[PDB]
Design the sequence.
RNA sequence: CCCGGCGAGGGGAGUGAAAAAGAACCUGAAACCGUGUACGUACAAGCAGUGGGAGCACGCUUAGGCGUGUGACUGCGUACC
RNA sequence: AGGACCGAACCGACUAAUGUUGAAAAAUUAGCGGAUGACUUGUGGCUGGGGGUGAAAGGCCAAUCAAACCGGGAGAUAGCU
RNA sequence: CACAGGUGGUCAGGUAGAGAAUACCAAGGCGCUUGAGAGAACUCGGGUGAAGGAACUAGGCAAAAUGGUGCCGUAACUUC
RNA sequence: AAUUCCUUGUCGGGUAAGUUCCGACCUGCACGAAUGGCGUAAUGAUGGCCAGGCUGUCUCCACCCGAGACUCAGUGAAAUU
RNA sequence: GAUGUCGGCUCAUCACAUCCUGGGGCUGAAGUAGGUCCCAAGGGUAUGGCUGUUCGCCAUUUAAAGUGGUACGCGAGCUGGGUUUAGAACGUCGUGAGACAGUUCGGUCCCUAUCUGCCGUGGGCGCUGGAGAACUGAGGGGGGCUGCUCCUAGUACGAGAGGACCGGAGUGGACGCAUCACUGGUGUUCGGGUUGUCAUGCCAAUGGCACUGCCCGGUAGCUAAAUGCGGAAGAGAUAAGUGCUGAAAGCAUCUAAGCACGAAACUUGCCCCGAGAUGAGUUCUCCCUGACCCUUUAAGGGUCCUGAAGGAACGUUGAAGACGACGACGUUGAUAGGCCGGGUGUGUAAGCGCAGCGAUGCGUUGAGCUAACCGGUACUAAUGAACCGUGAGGCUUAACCUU
């Protein structure tokens, strides 16, 4: 089963009857407007192409415009597609919204990664800050040696060094849905959504057992 | 640091290849005149969207 | 990085940023037209437009404030009496920055600054 | 035959089962068996680029009309 | 406590003046404590008619933190200093019969029916 | 959408008594406890501005006796029973921080008058 | 006489046997940096050399499988003191 | 009165941060001690290299000191590289 | 070297303050010449910290912290 | 012991603790009366130990400003080979 | 003609002869528990003191305090502290100079990254016309730990006390990732208070400057000391091991044929980058259907006419970031500043009236002033031209177009 492309829009410490407060993150649910709903009638391919959103989209290219023109006609924000399960999909006017979260207790959450600039040396990997004293040679902060000696004579792959994030996804996996609330369209999730505020996301129902 | 040997002159040229001065992709003229431009900035006659700039 | 921010600190400490902006704005109200760097030209726009806002109507406190941020006598006489009724009829955009080109002495990207209704201007040269 | 390699990560020698070579990329049992019979680096890449196996018994040189060969 | 060592104030009629934290309890590979943590104290002073004497090693609990304390609504009760009432070193509940200084409203449970219901101050 | 920072104003309650810094007040609350529902009070001086949308709270400092304690009671909390305004005292500051160590006759400010 | 700030530097016009003698001027290497041509560099690797060589320009190939220069590609292969 | 003191101006540099292909002849910035004295110190002068001069470090003796500088001996010598 | 180095004499205005400490300042000198921009790591300079209080390190340690005058009250040791 | 081959001696004390520090013992290193001894006030930019003031040195790190790095413009080195 | 040493941190990496969970035999093992005991690199694996220092001693955490290598990891990182210690001096020895693997006092490492690796990023080319959009998985890593008690279960078994695992479960601890509402932190782009001189002609008032002058509060952002939280059901191939059916050896036997079962490792499942996968992918969405001169012509060269879809420079600039790229987007425009409604800050704006012995306070004013965030407003600045991109785009078998 597919995901809902949300928007990160709100964070609230909300009260409950029992004198306990819950920090929560608030995702505004939009309905999926289908493009073509591609299926495995044609090739070995199986995924459903969805636009949950819109833009003024006065500067877009014709290959992007005819794509919204055959869809739900909403000058779309962009093109997201999703792998699917449990048989082929109902292909027109389908309008997947708050109902997806009606039986889902826990969600995966697939982010747009985290948009923290440079992130990079020392900070991103939470390393120690070298001594700020003792006349340490042109050095008040350093990450630490990335190899060993001539015997391997190299730096091994996968070491935590430097760089920007590259803004991939980052999935927390299996964090709780507190509630879903229809007609107001609020999905309260208990954990955080990746990125700064105002970001886009995918919140997709959990994969994991 | 230092270096091992004095390096070959093909190396010195590969090393500069991305740092070379890059093409301007042609030039601008005004949409509404035969006065020459400076692209998406204002000329010596104030010309872009009229008024006046740069009375030197 | 700089996420979910705006505006600018340019080249120095608060006192210098204040003193420079006083110099440059004090010069604006008397000369009508100036040239500076594009980040700097924006901070100038953002300094002068709130001084005009106080000045639309006479009001002794709004005259005191205008004398407090730029403590020069040439601007507070120009404000309110001359310059108050002029910009009275707009609600923001009393001035525009015109992106004039690069700086001759080095290259720092530059804008000419020019009042919204400015059409009378010296034709004398600048360096 | 567990195909020992050390691409760049994590403690241990690494491996892949004999079952991987048939369940996934099903050619691969014959491929990295004829691979080791070709010379050093570059020439052995130039020899190689003529072999194909596919997933098996779904082959796509129908139009060329292939010469059959018995071993 | 929050650093290794850390001297804090005595909060019961068991001893006198100040006492030194030797370890944090309620985990390991810890450098820092949460608010709801159980502390390990040594007594560096004591009082001749208290429950204890100098250099006896005990278990204890926080009654004030200068940083402040929280749990149910996440709102803090923030205090003027760190302070600790000693527990029994194996059989639980406080050792002292009196509290000295303020208290939290998070200690209001079956296992403290002795120590938050006292009259002397901050009831 | 338009919801960002707007959801703090939407949640914010309106049946809330008016306030100025140094206002004394009393928070009555429950103890909750193991088998019995009983109530209890705290009075003193409010040392800080409130208004935090939903997160708005009375930050009372008691500072009457003993060593200083600040208590934060959240206005929207279901276990908060009743709120009297009482006396309206002056400070000419947003905050009262200089009175932290003094507990003797510091939480008893006067009505401010004209 | 042309260009440029009154500049620096060069060219044209004109001088001489000669400026491929232009004022630091004698003819003039090599290092030195750059142009122009040929042909090369994106299934692509190590003393860059040796052996085999598609291809391509020029040489009436005297066409008699060659000469010249370059050279995809690749067997083999560890500088001098 | 004072081989006294806190302390500029005036002089030094115990320690600390920095510098270390520095601005630097350890300077800078901060803690610090001499300055009512065996202190700080301008001018003119003098002793010449295992020799001077030393409240002592085998200190300092023309941007330099457990061996100054130059001119001759001098192509020292080398059993050695 | 227009070296953040070294270097004798003379004259002596203001508020607070013990004064020629030290923030500013009257007459006066004078901008120790790259600039503007980025709100990147980081390097150097400069600023701040919950709670702790050197626990960092061979080592408190420059940032930060002491500092002035009026007055009470004043220890073990002392050649006072 | 600013002294101990063994040894980080023994015991008490400080102490979250104690190879250091301080006191007592001799089972005494090679202690021991002018490279002087016992003992002492004053004085030091003078050593170790302790708790308290205080502090981003640190636990444990976050953020701001500026010159470099970096961006744009100018000029344009060096260890090395 | 320099292969240069000790211990610790930061940062590591590789071998398993495994500290521990886990699966299994034996037992002088009833069960439990322990003694004995094999498979297993997957994962977690504590802190302060004194000493130059690993080891020590002592106080201490947890279920726990591992094994081995790495110029005996890591001075073109750190302490360079010890080790050489030149000076001094203790202790010691000799006529003496000077010494000590006895000792006490402070006191110096320098290298801007050329080739190479690593991580992050762009440029050039190619997937067969071009362009733009989603995307599959050949490939290769991330996560993988582990206490607690409830149930399971007071039951088999044992004289009696007692008495376990798998599975469901909540929850702690370590580890990993995001995050900024909560709680702190900072916030030289916001407010206020205040010392001094200098200043606004002068005062009441107010302002340049003094490290952001000093001092107290501070939005949004960012951030751990605060916040949420996975660590998985299931599958195969098995290991040690219990066998059945059965031979070598008429039988017996875990084995050899044969078949049920048997661990977190391993193939995975859960997570992520990924078609340069040249064996170059599918699928979606847009657009271009003119001509001659010449030569080696699946073609290339040259030219008139003529170039769409799209791109880039350029531009303001961002919820994206070194630069780029990515992204909003250039009057079709909320991009950014002003400006208006709203979030959230501060502490009562100059003047005036009034009271007072004046400083000063109080009514006008719950004032005024106000930053990043959110929505509006075209008020304002982004000529919005030209240009690079072209006229439907290979051979050959098979299948198709009268073929």
Sequence:
């Amino acid at each position: 089963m597919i995901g809902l492309v949300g928007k990160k829009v709100g964070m609230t410490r909300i009260f409950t009857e029992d004198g306990v407060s819950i920090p929560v993150t608030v995702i505004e649910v939009e309905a999926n407007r289908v493009t073509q709903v591609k299926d495995l009638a044609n090739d070995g391919y199986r995924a459903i192409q969805v636009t949950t959103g819109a833009k003024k989209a006065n500067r877009v290219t014709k290959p992007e415009a005819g794509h919204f023109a055959k869809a739900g006609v909403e000058a779309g924000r962009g093109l997201w597609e999703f792998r699917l399960a449990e048989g082929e999909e109902f292909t027109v006017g389908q309008s997947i919204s708050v109902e997806l979260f009606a039986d889902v207790k826990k969600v995966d959450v697939t982010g747009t990664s985290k948009g923290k600039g440079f992130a990079g040396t020392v900070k991103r990997w939470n390393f120690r800050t070298q001594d700020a004293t003792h006349g340490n040679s042109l050095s008040h902060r350093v990450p630490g040696s990335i190899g060993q000696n001539q015997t391997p004579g190299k730096v091994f792959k996968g070491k935590k060094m430097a760089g920007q994030m590259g803004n991939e996804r980052v999935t927390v996996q299996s964090l709780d849905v507190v509630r879903v609330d229809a007609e107001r369209n609020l999905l309260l999730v208990k954990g955080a959504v990746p990125g700064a505020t105002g970001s886009d996301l995918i919140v997709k129902p959990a994969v994991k057992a | 640091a230092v270096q091992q040997n004095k390096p070959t002159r093909s190396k010195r040229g590969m090393r500069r290849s991305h740092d070379a001065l890059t093409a301007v992709t042609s030039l601008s003229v005004d949409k509404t005149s035969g006065e020459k431009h400076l692209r998406h900035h204002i000329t010596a006659d104030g010309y872009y969207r009229g008024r006046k700039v740069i009375a030197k | 990085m700089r996420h979910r921010k705006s505006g600018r600190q340019l080249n120095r400490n608060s006192s210098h940023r204040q003193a420079m902006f006083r110099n440059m704005a004090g010069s604006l109200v008397r000369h009508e037209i100036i040239k500076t760097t594009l980040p700097k030209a924006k901070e100038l726009r953002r300094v002068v437009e709130p001084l005009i806002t106080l000045a639309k109507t006479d009001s002794v406190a709004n005259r005191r404030l205008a004398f407090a941020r730029t403590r020069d006598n040439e601007i507070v006489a120009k404000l309110f009496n001359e310059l108050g009724p002029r910009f009275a009829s707009r609600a923001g955009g009393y001035t525009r920055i015109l992106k004039c080109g690069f700086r001759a002495g080095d290259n720092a990207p530059m804008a000419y600054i020019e009042l919204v209704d400015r059409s009378e201007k010296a034709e004398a040269a600048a360096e | 035959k567990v195909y020992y390699h050390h691409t760049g990560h994590i403690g241990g020698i690494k491996q892949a089962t004999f079952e991987e070579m048939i369940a996934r990329r099903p050619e691969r049992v014959i491929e990295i068996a004829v691979k080791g019979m070709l010379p050093k680096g570059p020439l052995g890449r130039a020899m190689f680029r003529k072999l194909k196996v596919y997933a098996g018994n779904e082959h796509n040189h129908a139009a060329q009309q292939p010469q059959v060969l018995d071993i | 406590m929050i650093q290794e060592q850390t001297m804090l104030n005595v909060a019961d009629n068991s001893g006198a003046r100040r006492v030194m934290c030797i370890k944090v309890l309620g985990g390991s590979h810890r450098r820092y404590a949460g608010v709801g943590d159980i502390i390990k104290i040594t007594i560096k002073e004591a009082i001749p008619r208290g429950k204890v004497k100098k250099g006896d090693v005990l278990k204890a609990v926080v009654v004030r933190t200068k940083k402040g304390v929280r749990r149910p609504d996440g709102s803090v009760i923030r205090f003027d200093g760190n302070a600790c009432v000693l527990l029994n070193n194996n059989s639980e509940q406080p050792i002292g019969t009196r509290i000295f200084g303020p208290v939290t409203r998070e200690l209001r449970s079956e296992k403290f029916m002795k120590i938050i219901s006292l009259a002397p101050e901050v009831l | 959408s338009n919801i960002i920072k707007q959801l703090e104003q939407e949640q914010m309650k309106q049946d809330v008594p008016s306030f100025r810094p140094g206002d004394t007040v009393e928070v009555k609350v429950w103890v909750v406890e193991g088998s019995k529902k009983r109530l209890q009070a705290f009075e003193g001086v409010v040392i800080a501005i409130r208004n935090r949308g939903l997160h708005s709270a009375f930050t009372v400092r008691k500072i009457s006796n003993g060593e200083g304690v600040e208590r934060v009671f959240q206005t929207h909390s279901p276990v908060v029973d009743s709120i009297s305004v009482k006396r309206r005292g002056a400070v000419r500051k947003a905050k009262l921080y200089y009175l932290r160590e003094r507990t003797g006759k510091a939480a008893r400010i006067k009505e401010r008058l004209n």
